[PDB]
Amino acid sequence: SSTASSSSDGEGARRLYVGNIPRNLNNDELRTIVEEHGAIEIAEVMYDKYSGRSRRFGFVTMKTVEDANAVIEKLNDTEIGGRKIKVNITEKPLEGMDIATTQAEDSQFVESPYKVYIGNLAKTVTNELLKDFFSEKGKVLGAKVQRTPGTSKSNGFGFVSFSSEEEVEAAIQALNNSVLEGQKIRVNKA
RNA sequence: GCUGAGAAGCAAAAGGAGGAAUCCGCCCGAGGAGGGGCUCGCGUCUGAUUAGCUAGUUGGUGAGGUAAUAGCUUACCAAGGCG
C-alpha cells in the first residue's frame, strides 16, 4: 500500500493537493469526487476526525500526471459537504490512509444532530440547572457545562444530549432567544 | 552609493497571504516613460498733460543656501544696470 505512495513519488505529478475538505468529508467521497477526473490509485485524508470533522488537508494520487493536471484545474471551486476545496499541487502523496481510515472508522462515535450546544448561559447557571432544563423538556441523557480549565468558573458554555433527535430539534427551536437568568442563550444542534 | 586629492570614513532592510508552490511587498543602487522645477531668443494693451529710474540696485569674490543655476542670502570690493 506504501507501494501506492512510492509509485506516486516516483512519478512526479500524480500529486494533487486538496485544501478545505469539509467536516463530513471522508476518503470515499474524496475518491468519488476525484475519480471522475481519472483512476485514482490512492487518496490521503489527514486525521483531525476526533469527531466527524476533518483537518481539511488531503492528498490524491492519480495514475497519470495529466489526470492530476485536469483534477487540479477542474476541482477548484468544488463544494463538498457545504465547504469548498482548492486543488493546487501537493507534495508527492502520502498514503498512510489505511491507518487513518481505520482510526476514522473507530473514532466516529456520535451520529446525527443528537446533541445540543449551549450559548449564552449566565455565570450563575449550574450543572444541575442544565440537568433541570434538559430533563424538564423531552427525555434526556446527560448534561455538561464547559467550565474554565485555568480555574473553574462556567465561562458560560455547555451541552445536552437528549434521548431523541426530535427532542434535540424541539429544544433548539423552543430555547433559542432564551433567557436564563441574566443572559440570552442560543442553542444549536451539534 | 556618498564625502574627500588621496588617506580614510559614512550608510539599509519588513513583513504579510498561502499546506506548499508562489504572490504582494520592503532596502540599496542604474536607466527609461510620463510628470514637474528652472533659464533664454521672439510675440504679448493704452497714456509723455507720467522723464528720469534703480543702491542687493547691476556686476565680482568669499562665506552660506536651494532638488538645481542664480543677489537666492550675507560681508567686502567695482559702479554699474534700464530708458
Swiss-Prot record:
Membrane-traversing stretches: none
Domain of life: Eukaryota
Record flagged with keyword Chloroplast: yes
Gene Ontology MF terms: mRNA binding; rRNA binding
GO cellular component, one term: chloroplast thylakoid membrane
Region (Disordered): 1-13
Localisation: Plastid, Chloroplast
RRM domain: residues covered: 14-92, 114-190
Keyword Plastid tagged: yes
GO BP term (any one): chloroplast rRNA processing
Quaternary structure, from the entry: Component of the chloroplast small ribosomal subunit (SSU). Mature 70S chloroplast ribosomes of higher plants consist of a small (30S) and a large (50S) subunit. The 30S small subunit contains 1 molecule of ribosomal RNA (16S rRNA) and 24 different proteins. The 50S large subunit contains 3 rRNA molecules (23S, 5S and 4.5S rRNA) and 33 different proteins.
Function: Component of the chloroplast ribosome (chloro-ribosome), a dedicated translation machinery responsible for the synthesis of chloroplast genome-encoded proteins, including proteins of the transcription and translation machinery and components of the photosynthetic apparatus. cS22 may have a role in the recruitment of stored chloroplast mRNAs for active protein synthesis.
Family according to the record: Belongs to the chloroplast-specific ribosomal protein cS22 family.
Protein name (record): Small ribosomal subunit protein cS22
Protein source organism: Spinacia oleracea
Lineage of source species: Eukaryota, Viridiplantae, Streptophyta, Embryophyta, Tracheophyta
Gene encoding the protein: PSRP2
